[PDB]
């Protein structure tokens with residue numbers, strides 16, 4: 116099985132993920148990821164969302180290694196081919212498969228998530244739909260897969276900020292990152308216990324609904340969670356503030 120992106124031939128190895136993602140090999144026998152997108156039944160608002168996300172991904176590549184590498188692309192009126200770097204596994208399936216997560220790898224992953232989200236924020240981008248499925252493990256390093264600009268773990272309200280439920284600033288991405296770190300800390304998201312979707316949304320917003328923060332041996336890690344998971348965006352810690360917190364800095 117084969118395919119041609121900008122005159123270069125790529126051999127398919129396996130499918131990873133309208134859109135199909137594949138693991139491929141080039142002529143020089145190097146491993147890549149090819150995202151295929153079918154534009155056939157797509158509107159102008161959809162096309163603009165797609166061209167906007169590609170342009171942001173192409174630009175933000177130069178600013179951080181914690182953003183997925185985009186090597187090349189081919190765009191027509193019928194399709195998109197994106198030659199990207201191949202990750203090992205996404206953060207979600209890595210966590211789902213793992214029972215207990217190492218405190219050193221968790222601190223390391225946190226640092227990477229802050230670096231990536233901070234970059235998009237410096238360029239005016241608020242992701243708003245952050246989940247572990249949005250991050251990629253590549254050579255013991257987390258990488259942000261996308262920016263939330265392009266149309267369409269999906270649907271999930273577990274990482275949703277209170278401000279998003281009511282209706283959006285960088286503080287929204289802070290709430291979501293805090294939910295991801297909470298999962299890597301406690302083994303569940305803060306509201307995971309609630310099956311009923313409405314009853315879950317009714318708890319995320321309600322301030323009288325106290326989020327449990329059980330006593331862990333990492334006092335700094337407990338403080339981060341308590342700082343991220345504050346219902347009032349005004350009272351929530353910022354990304355530049357998180358990057359200076361003792362949890363990220365102290366050895």
Ligand SMILES: c1cc2cnc3sccc3c2cn1
Pocket residue numbers: 131132136148150199200201202203204205251260
């Ligand atoms: C674009 C590029 C990717 C590269 N590597 C991997 S490994 C598991 C998912 C993915 C992936 C998804 N979208």
